[PDB]
């Protein structure tokens, strides 16, 4: 039940550093840091990249159906009245419905308004925002899958 600082992503393209608000959603932050600590993202990829919307990432199955948690497959939401989906580079926990969150995050690329109805924000990107846009410029298909591998190499709950 310890509180690490900023999480280092080390993607195939470069480094991105996420800031996490221990002020507002600590349970997701502990979960995200622990999965980063144990090495649960080492080799997972950005499977769903929609242009000018978001980048869903992080699944050992690579399907966009997989994931568990440190509590086990589900935990509640933290729909906080302060965090609002505003601009690019917000980090947020990808959902499948009410109070069901696994281990899939998504980094957002534009202001979205219908999102914060039903998703938990916990984070924002803070180092090399242009590299996110380079991930944003990745070739897609009908199901919005990348042709190459945009995978996360390593991740560090540093500090």
Asked whether position 125 contacts other proteins by CB under 8 A, the answer is yes
Tell me the window of 36-44, 59-67, 70-78, 80-88 that interacts with other proteins (CB under 8 A). Answer: 80-88
Q: How far apart are CA 123 and CA 106, in angstroms?
A: 10
Asked whether position 85 contacts other proteins by CB under 8 A, the answer is yes
Q: Left, alpha or beta for 62 (phi > 0: left; psi -120 to 50: alpha)?
A: left
Tell me the window of 29-37, 59-67, 98-106, 123-131 that interacts with other proteins (CB under 8 A). Answer: 123-131
Query: Is 95 marked active-site?
Result: yes
Query: Is 134 marked active-site?
Result: no
The token pair at 149 is 């591998």
Q: From the list 54, 83, 94, 115, which residue makes contact with other proteins (rule: CB under 8 A)?
A: 83
In angstroms, the Cα distances linking 67 to 58, 105, 141 are: 8, 11, 23
Query: Is 6 marked active-site?
Result: no
Asked whether position 158 contacts other proteins by CB under 8 A, the answer is no
Identify residues 46-75 at the interface with other proteins (CB under 8 A). 51-52
If the CB atoms of residues 1 and 143 are measured against other proteins, the closer one turns out to be 143
Q: Which positions are catalytic?
A: 48, 53, 56, 95, 106, 115, 119
């Amino acid at each position: 039940s310890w509180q690490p600082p900023n999480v280092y992503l080390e993607t195939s393209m470069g480094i991105i550093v996420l800031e996490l608000y221990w002020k507002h959603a600590p349970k997701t932050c502990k979960n995200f840091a622990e999965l980063a600590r144990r090495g649960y993202y080492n080799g997972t990829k950005f499977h769903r990249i929609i242009k000018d919307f978001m980048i869903q990432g992080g699944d050992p199955t690579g399907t966009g159906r997989g994931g568990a948690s440190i509590y086990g497959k589900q935990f509640e939401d933290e729909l906080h009245p302060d965090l609002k989906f505003t601009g690019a580079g917000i980090l947020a926990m990808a959902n499948a419905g009410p109070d069901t969150n696994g281990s899939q995050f998504f980094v957002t690329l534009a202001p979205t308004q219908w999102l914060d109805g039903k998703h938990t924000i916990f984070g924002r990107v803070c180092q090399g925002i242009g590299m996110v846009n380079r991930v944003g410029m990745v070739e897609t298909n009908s199901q919005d899958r990348p042709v190459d591998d945009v995978k996360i190499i390593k991740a560090y709950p540093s500090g």
